[PDB]
Amino acid sequence: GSSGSSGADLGRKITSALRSLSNATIINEEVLNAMLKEVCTALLEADVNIKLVKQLRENVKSAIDLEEMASGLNKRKMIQHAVFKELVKVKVYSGPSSG
């Protein structure tokens, strides 16, 4: 079963992931790493090439900073958005990009 044609379930697969953070209190490299396995999946369940999804995690993890992050709800924010943001990137097609 599946109604509509666009996705939905997609962001829903990741949503829960990112949502796993808002709940999480620790928040560390592991988390992202773990949560990633939950996100990277969605992408993998989309069509994106593993080689890409393998470059996303980094581009994402690198977009953050677990190597050194005191503490702040922001982290969970900038993180929850970071990902949701990267999803927008995923290798621009030909928009407002500067290589």
UniProtKB/Swiss-Prot annotation:
Signal peptide positions (record): none
Cell compartments where the protein resides: Nucleus speckle; Cytoplasm; Endoplasmic reticulum
Domain of life according to the entry: Eukaryota
Subunit details: Component of a signal recognition particle (SRP) complex that consists of a 7SL RNA molecule of 300 nucleotides and six protein subunits: SRP72, SRP68, SRP54, SRP19, SRP14 and SRP9. Interacts with RNPS1. Interacts with the SRP receptor subunit SRPRA.
UniProt remark on domains: The NG domain, also named G domain, is a special guanosine triphosphatase (GTPase) domain, which binds GTP and forms a guanosine 5'-triphosphate (GTP)-dependent complex with a homologous NG domain in the SRP receptor subunit SRPRA. The two NG domains undergo cooperative rearrangements upon their assembly, which culminate in the reciprocal activation of the GTPase activity of one another. SRP receptor compaction upon binding with cargo-loaded SRP and GTPase rearrangement drive SRP-mediated cotranslational protein translocation into the ER. The M domain binds the 7SL RNA in presence of SRP19 and binds the signal sequence of presecretory proteins.
Role according to the record: Component of the signal recognition particle (SRP) complex, a ribonucleoprotein complex that mediates the cotranslational targeting of secretory and membrane proteins to the endoplasmic reticulum (ER). As part of the SRP complex, associates with the SRP receptor (SR) component SRPRA to target secretory proteins to the endoplasmic reticulum membrane. Binds to the signal sequence of presecretory proteins when they emerge from the ribosomes. Displays basal GTPase activity, and stimulates reciprocal GTPase activation of the SR subunit SRPRA.
Family named by the database record: Belongs to the GTP-binding SRP family. SRP54 subfamily.
Protein name: Signal recognition particle subunit SRP54
Organism for this UniProt entry: Mus musculus (Mouse)
